[PDB]
Design a binder for this molecule. Structure first.
Ligand SMILES: [Cu+2]
Length: 128
């Protein structure tokens, strides 16, 4: 796929990919989240967070702090250029970011913020 990537997350708390390379001429990427599973968004939710590793943890720890209604996300985090809604069982959400937001050289990680999710589910983004 050009300047889009068909991601997913599942009941077996695993991401179907653990890395993403974005195209330097991509002038707008997309990440279409897809939940194939039987667990609700309240006990096995997932979401795609775009943010370096220099702040991944904090967006995490400060993510599971923002209630459950605040999609276990700190409201208006600058430490996230892009993120997806908290879908769940049979749900499907996405997000498209500015590839001018994506700085070269700087490492980058996507993950899940649901209390103890980022730990397991994640993967490296890059600007090849
Ligand atoms: Cu998750």
């Amino acid at each position: 796929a050009e300047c889009s990537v068909d991601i997913q997350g599942n009941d077996q708390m695993q991401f179907n990919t653990n890395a993403i390379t974005v195209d330097k001429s991509c002038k707008q990427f997309t990440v279409n989240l897809s939940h194939p599973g039987n667990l609700p968004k309240n006990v096995m939710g997932h979401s795609w967070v775009l943010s370096t590793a220099a702040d991944m943890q904090g967006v995490v720890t400060d993510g599971m702090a923002s209630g459950l209604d605040k999609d276990y996300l700190k409201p208006d985090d600058s430490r996230v250029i892009a993120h997806t809604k908290l879908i769940g069982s049979g749900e499907k959400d996405s997000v498209t970011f500015d590839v001018s937001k994506l700085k070269e050289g700087e490492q980058y990680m996507f993950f899940c913020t649901f209390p103890g999710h980022s730990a397991l589910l994640k993967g490296t983004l890059t600007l090849k």
